Amino acid sequence: SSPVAQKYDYILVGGGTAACVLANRLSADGSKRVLVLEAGPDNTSRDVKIPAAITRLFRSPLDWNLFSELQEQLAERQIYMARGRLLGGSSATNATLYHRGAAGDYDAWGVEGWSSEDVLSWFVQAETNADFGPGAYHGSGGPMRVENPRYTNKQLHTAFFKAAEEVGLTPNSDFNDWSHDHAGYGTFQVMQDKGTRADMYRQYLKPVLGRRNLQVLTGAAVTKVNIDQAQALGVEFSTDGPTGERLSAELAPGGEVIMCAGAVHTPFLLKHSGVGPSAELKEFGIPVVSNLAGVGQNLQDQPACLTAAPVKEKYDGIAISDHIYNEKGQIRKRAIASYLLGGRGGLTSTGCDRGAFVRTAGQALPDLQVRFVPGMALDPDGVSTYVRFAKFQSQGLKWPSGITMQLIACRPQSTGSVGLKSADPFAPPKLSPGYLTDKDGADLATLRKGIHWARDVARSSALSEYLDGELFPGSGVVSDDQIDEYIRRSIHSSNAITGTCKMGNAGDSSSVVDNQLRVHGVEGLRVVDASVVPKIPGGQTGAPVVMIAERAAALLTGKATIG
Ligand SMILES: Cc1cc2nc3c(=O)[nH]c(=O)nc-3n(C[C@H](O)[C@H](O)[C@H](O)COP(=O)(O)OP(=O)(O)OC[C@H]3O[C@@H](n4cnc5c(N)ncnc54)[C@H](O)[C@@H]3O)c2cc1C
């Protein structure tokens, strides 16, 4: 009752990160009626705008509340895998960290037309950096806002840098500069506009919500893509939910359907739509339009574990938790006041924006990403501690002061999968992260060796002055087996998730899309989001998504060509 006898030049499934970019650039003439269907609501939550309230988006209405299948290798647990559920997608719920990884990450893709020399200009074109001048690696005129974090914990952040220096790391002054090596300790830039989250809704969709050729439907959950037998022809959605009406939205002659539901829900929606490994599709009774074996497969996420330690009594009150809560658990008015009048203070932080990239075994690129938090975890799952921190508000308790080190396998070797669990298009997908299953034990050894590195750092003079004990894993965890066990029980997602509809050269029987993001054997169906990432780059994945979406956009409208 919303696309009523209206034929669209481009239909966008999902109003996420890449989708926001695409609507902007495709709606930019006047000739292309673009539609955007977003399951979740509009972007208006204050908890999304204030970076520190990331703590309140986890397991919230605005998250998809996805949970993995049982992971036998991880002590038979389910793994919460947070995903944003609103316009802008996970850019509105993410940690705001700005990482491109290294140039080799892209060269390793092997795909023609998408080497590091091909991607670098599309990063720079999307960026306005408050803290680096315009150059080969940084932009000044692009829609994204990037800045150095406007919080500093004067005492713990400096001691982390002194500690890292003590154990032999050297600094890196820009982890996104491909003229020097990726490893090093340093400060991560953040996707923030003076301490407000600068999500892709705010930076791209909001400035164009008035173009008459641009129609944005929130609350609109797509259930399949119409493919008349091969050619996509529309989508089906429901404006209320599982128990509503099954509307349809037709395309114009020449109109394409761009998948933008993310590396979780896109390979899910495609499988419901007829594109996937047939042996899986037959089992639920879905005809096969295209039998591509790579849909669902190659899921790549970056696992994390953590260490935490309290600070000595004499340093009580110098943690970021002390800057956000008072001894009774109410938000400090000084922290509110510095945020609102100046865009400074604890509220601007997601807490994890200083750290390191480390080679644990002389790998070619860093296998380990460290995120240092000047606050103390109280649960060894880091995602839970943030949930816990939110609910800790006004309980009358005092969150103890300490530090945390989150360790991340940033170029992991284990692959996962996204599959069908029900015929119900409103059912949760079958999701298996598959961390720690690479045949060589290499991801587990990255993290185990990360733990030893984090204790060396904590044991340095620089940090031992402040620290007093270790709470996680703790004194009882000495042996490697004991470390490996703790990893298996506390391992959590650093929240990347790429590769489920990966692109590849012609003749790649494993690839789902081609170097122009068109899925094989279907007409007018493209995929532009984190699924197409053939090999996950070293770091958080928001930025490479934006790049991919800019590139795909300028390709569609004939401003650039690939290969
Ligand atoms: C908690 C968290 C922290 C992160 N931190 C960082 C970080 O600090 N820096 C960084 O660079 N990256 C970070 N990431 C990753 C980054 O946010 C994502 O990889 C990136 O935003 C993915 O973009 P996308 O367009 O592929 O997906 P999304 O932005 O998730 O877009 C997919 C969209 O599809 C919608 N959708 C799903 N199913 C349907 C359906 N049936 N019908 C309609 N719409 C549907 C979803 O609601 C969503 O809006 C983080 C991720 C999370 C979850």
Residue numbers in the entry: 77 to 305, 310 to 643
Authors' description from the paper:
Absorption of a blue-light photon by the flavin adenine dinucleotide (FAD) cofactor within FAP triggers the decarboxylation of the fatty-acid substrate, which leads to the formation of a hydrocarbon molecule and CO2. Forward electron transfer from the fatty-acid substrate to the photoexcited FAD occurs in 300 ps and is accompanied by concomitant decarboxylation of the latter, as shown by time-resolved visible and infrared (IR) absorption spectroscopies, respectively.
In order to model the structural changes that had occurred at the different time points, structure-factor extrapolation was carried out using Xtrapol8, which estimates the structure-factor amplitudes F ext that would have been measured for each pump–probe data set if the photo-triggered intermediate were present in the crystals at 100% occupancy (equation 1). The occupancy of intermediate states was determined to be between 25% and 35% for the four time delays. Three possible explanations can be offered: (i) the spatial overlap between the pump and probe laser changed slightly, (ii) the apparent difference reflects the noise level of the data or (iii) at 900 ps a positive peak due to photodecarboxylated CO2 compensates part of the negative peak on the carboxyl group.
